[model samples]
Target: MNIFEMLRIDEGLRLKIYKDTEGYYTIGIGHLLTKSPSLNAAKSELDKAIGRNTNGVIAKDEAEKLFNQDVDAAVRGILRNAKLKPVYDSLDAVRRAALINMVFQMGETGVAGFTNSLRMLQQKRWDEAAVNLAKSRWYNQTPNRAKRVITTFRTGTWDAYK
Candidate 1:
């Protein structure tokens, strides 16, 4: 539930289509509706995911299901990263949730770009890890969410829920 709570705070839920902060067409808890190739392909994907042709809206159950699938992918992605294995192993539940929250937003490869920050986290140097995280462009883009996530990393607390 820790991951769920943090994601709810970060991603939120929307039954209707809307533009995310980055201006992408997103729906159902940050599910990116835009296809890498084309809008037609993306619409096909969305229809398949929703189990029906959507009219720019999704049902609550469908959104919840998408959230679960996305979370599952994020968790798996985090664990699959060799660089994060030991760092993840050293974390407590709160800190682990913090990492997962980050992975959920930034894909595993994106999170892996934090070479120094990952090293700091691996050593459990909370403040240094936080400082490195705060130095990222993500911090500038989504300042409030980044602040809460950074604080969670620094203090090993559920600041995302606060």
Candidate 2:
């Protein structure tokens, strides 16, 4: 049987399979959750109960590949759609990585809304970018995460552990 067919519905399973243009399968928090024999065998039964996949399983690797592809596409879309050509054209590797990391965490809408932050970045104002980053709604929602990424952007350092 195919992967979808093997995922036989069971009453007590609380299994849900949602379909979208992407494909047919259960999705939770934008992530696809589906059955995999190798994944099920490796993980604890309880993990399988909630539909979490096992690491190192073929299905898990496939899922990760899909996820990374999506991320790359999203990053490219953000840069293209937002008209961030100047930033992309001029950014060095470290600054570009920092920007991409922020975009990855924030999503396109979130990063796009950072008007003042973008202005600061355009001016090559690293400190102002850090400060404007701290003032964002996303910053309020995820202070630690925002601060760490901002620090990385400003200092070209990745020592925000904790």
Candidate 3:
């Protein structure tokens, strides 16, 4: 499966505004509007995509556009981070997807904070990387997603899609 497909499955979809597990105002496919640099700009894009300024809903097609944008941003964010880019480039496709998915869920800043986890990943210590990730509060907030991420890191496979 592609990165887009994997993220769609993991993040799920929402046509209307909903609070994420972290209680942030999110829309579309896990697009955290609250985290946008400019709320009006974000809202304007949503309005343009959905062709409305009132309804708090987004169509699947509209959501796809937003998802693409979000994924692109996340990918760029991960690749641009000095510390993260090396680890990202060292991973295989499946593990790379897992890392990108993590960046999508949590910003690069958030993922970059995983000091020991990144070290383990850099060393290709898969099990140790997984263990370090499991020790984070992110695991506590979203256990299922974190489990999939950890499993992918541990096995260097695409079991998260399954």
The candidate scoring highest on TM-score is 1
- Per-residue error (Å), model 3, residue 125: 0.4
Off by over 4 Å in 1: 35-41
TM-score winner between candidates 2 and 3: 3
lDDT of each: 0.84, 0.53, 0.84
lDDT, candidate 1, 130-150, per-residue tens: 988999899999999999989
Tens digit of per-residue lDDT, candidate 2, span 9-122: 110112223432224233322233444434343244424534555342334444444445545765586568545556655666656666665555445666777777777887
- Which digits, one per residue and each the tens of the lDDT, describe model 3 over residues 1-162? 778888888889988777788766678898887755554655775676566783567778878888998899988998899989999999899889888999999889999999889989989998878887998899998899889878988997776668
TM-score list, all predictions: 0.92, 0.59, 0.89
The TM-score measured for candidate 2 stands at: 0.59
Which ten residues in a row are the worst by lDDT in model 2? 3-12
> Which lDDT value does model 3 have at 151?
92
The root-mean-square deviation over C-alpha atoms between each candidate and the true structure, in angstroms, is 1.7, 12.5, 2.9
lDDT score at residue 34, model 3, on the 0-100 scale:
71
lDDT of 2 at 53: 52
